[PDB]
Amino acid sequence: SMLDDAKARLRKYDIGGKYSHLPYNKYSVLLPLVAKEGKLHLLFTVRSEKLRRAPGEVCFPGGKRDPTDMDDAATALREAQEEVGLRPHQVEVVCCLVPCLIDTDTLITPFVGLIDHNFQAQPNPAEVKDVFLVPLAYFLHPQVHDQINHIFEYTNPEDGVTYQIKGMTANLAVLVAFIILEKKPT
Ligand SMILES: O=C(Cc1cccc(O)c1)Nc1cccnc1
């Protein structure tokens, strides 16, 4: 099946807890996979204008680890719940992908999660301005604009709204697309 095939692919890239105890400032993100219309999608947030860091940017749900978190996956799930109402029974964490080093003192750990088909996002407007899906296959043939660094522009065909996706968020989306979609029979 599509979902069993995706999970099987993802597990081959799982680094697990290998880098998780290193003494960094620690953040986790959830890369949330949603199956709709017979295809996989990633769920993204647009950060609120209220926020201090990166107002109005597209990013995955996530945030800073706190003392309550049993592990880095827990960070991702707690933050996703706060941001978009995703409850833990609604997500299966499949793997931990390569962490992202930034600012010399920070390590961001990405987890891929399969999202239940009955989840409906409840954007928390103190943190999130918008929530939207992009088909995973888009990231194989993105619409690129150079700002010099590469920016993806995705237009939602449901409503014509264009979102800009860039940086770590864009990079991780392409990684997941490669992992899941490469070398597949039609
Ligand atoms: O803050 C995060 C996680 C994160 C950590 C590092 C980098 C990044 O792009 C994203 N996610 C969030 C926060 C508020 C609203 N929507 C998404």
Side-chain angles (χ1 to χ4, degrees), residues 27-45:
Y27 293 72
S28 299
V29 296
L30 181 69
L31 283 26
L33 285 169
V34 172
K36 298 287 192 216
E37 311 175 340
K39 311 181 309 171
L40 294 167
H41 299 69
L42 281 164
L43 181 150
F44 296 84
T45 69

Side-chain angles (χ1 to χ4, degrees), residues 67-146 148-182:
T68 73
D69 296 324
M70 293 291 297
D71 59 21
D72 288 326
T75 306
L77 295 193
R78 177 174 56 70
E79 291 276 346
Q81 186 163 1
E82 183 63 32
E83 291 152 4
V84 307
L86 181 72
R87 291 159 71 190
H89 70 93
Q90 302 186 115
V91 48
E92 182 185 359
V93 177
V94 179
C95 67
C96 177
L97 293 178
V98 287
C100 306
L101 303 178
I102 60 161
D103 292 334
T104 75
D105 61 10
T106 299
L107 190 146
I108 303 165
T109 301
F111 292 86
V112 182
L114 295 195
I115 303 307
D116 190 74
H117 74 312
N118 291 128
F119 169 71
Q120 289 180 140
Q122 299 184 254
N124 171 355
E127 291 171 350
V128 167
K129 174 157 64 160
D130 196 359
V131 176
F132 66 102
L133 301 181
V134 183
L136 191 61
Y138 166 84
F139 298 99
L140 303 184
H141 296 285
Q143 186 178 287
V144 180
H145 277 87
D146 299 343
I148 281 185
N149 88 131
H150 303 303
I151 289 172
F152 297 161
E153 297 196 341
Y154 173 72
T155 305
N156 182 354
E158 291 289 304
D159 66 9
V161 174
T162 300
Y163 298 89
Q164 292 188 334
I165 312 182
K166 69 199 187 165
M168 182 192 75
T169 300
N171 283 260
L172 288 169
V174 170
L175 176 62
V176 175
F178 286 175
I179 287 166
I180 294 177
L181 303 176
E182 74 169 343

